[PDB]
Design a binder for this molecule. Structure first.
Ligand SMILES: CCCCCCOCCOCCOCCN[C@H](O)c1ccc(NNN)cc1
Ligand SMILES: [Cl-]
Length: 290
């Protein structure tokens, strides 16, 4: 599994900040837009993009405050990322897109797709943001840690000061051991603790047990839209997973229209880091059908 990030940096101005993105493949055709989440960056797509770049344009932005993108003075709420990603999409002049989305990026993709259904030709997703109406539906092994994360004293102490989300939560979202090179690639944007605000605000935006209300409403909305959308869907899942356990993935695969489902084997949250070969191969093959 590759550790290197061999991509020339691209930068675009958006709402006064500079956003970094990978842009490879042919200039023409329908672009494939890769959206990462917390606590990663476009580095999480480094081994999947090369299966798609031979025949399709690949665009992979770094969310604002993450990756190589600018890090302004923000609360980094979900709405901030919504604004910035909308402006990024409109600044690259994209009309029709195929979405490949993960974690909070999925929330960004889905919420974009619901508002622009005519502009989405396909969605490939995995370990995505779904409503969790009670804490019982959250994974037991992450319950205590993510409840502690959702406070302004202990949560900020763990995530902001001690970098627990990068040094602990991130490698526990991967079955196989991450190497020190990959760990350094994930550490790079957050070496300065004051730059760790998104790492803390993201788990505090998670829609668990009705809080926060706005995110619960929004995520419920795009799930309702997805359940009746004819958009072609490609769902990846792993064992035991984090945000999507196998039983939920099977339920969704049976209920979602035009949905191909793929079990990647052992996997937690960062499915890209456990089985990139299968994910990239399946995405290339599935794109061949849009
Ligand atoms: C917004 C997107 C969602 C982000 C979710 C992040 O995912 C992590 C969630 O789990 C964290 C709580 O885990 C506690 C128990 N974990 C086991 O101790 C453990 C230990 C080591 C390994 N791997 N070693 N290579 C795997 C598991
Ligand atoms: Cl999170």
């Amino acid at each position: 599994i590759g550790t290197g990030f061999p991509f020339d940096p691209h930068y675009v101005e958006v709402l006064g900040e500079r956003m970094h993105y990978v842009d490879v493949g042919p200039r023409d055709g329908t672009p494939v837009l890769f959206l990462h989440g917390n606590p990663t960056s476009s580095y999480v797509w480094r081994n999947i993009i090369p299966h798609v770049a031979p025949t399709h344009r690949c665009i992979a932005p770094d969310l604002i405050g993450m990756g190589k993108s600018d890090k302004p003075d923000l609360g980094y709420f979900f709405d901030d990322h919504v604004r910035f990603m909308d402006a990024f999409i409109e600044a690259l002049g994209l009309e029709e897109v195929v979405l490949v989305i993960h974690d909070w990026g999925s929330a960004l993709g889905f919420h974009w797709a619901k508002r622009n259904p005519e502009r989405v030709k396909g969605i490939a997703f995995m370990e995505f943001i779904r409503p969790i109406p009670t804490w019982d539906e959250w994974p037991e092994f992450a319950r205590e840690t993510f409840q502690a994360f959702r406070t302004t004293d202990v949560g900020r102490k763990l995530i902001i000061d001690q970098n627990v989300f990068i040094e602990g939560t991130l490698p526990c979202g991967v079955v196989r051991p991450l190497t020190e090179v990959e760990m350094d690639h994930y550490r790079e944007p957050f070496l300065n603790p004051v730059d760790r605000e998104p790492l803390w605000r993201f788990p505090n935006e998670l829609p668990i047990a009705g809080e926060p209300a706005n995110i619960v409403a929004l995520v419920e909305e795009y799930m309702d839209w997805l359940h009746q959308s004819p958009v072609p869907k490609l769902l990846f899942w792993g064992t035991p997973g984090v945000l999507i356990p196998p039983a939920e993935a099977a339920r969704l695969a049976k209920s979602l229209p035009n949905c191909k489902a793929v079990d990647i084997g052992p996997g937690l949250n960062l499915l890209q880091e456990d089985n990139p070969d299968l994910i990239g191969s399946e995405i290339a093959r599935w794109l061949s059908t849009l």
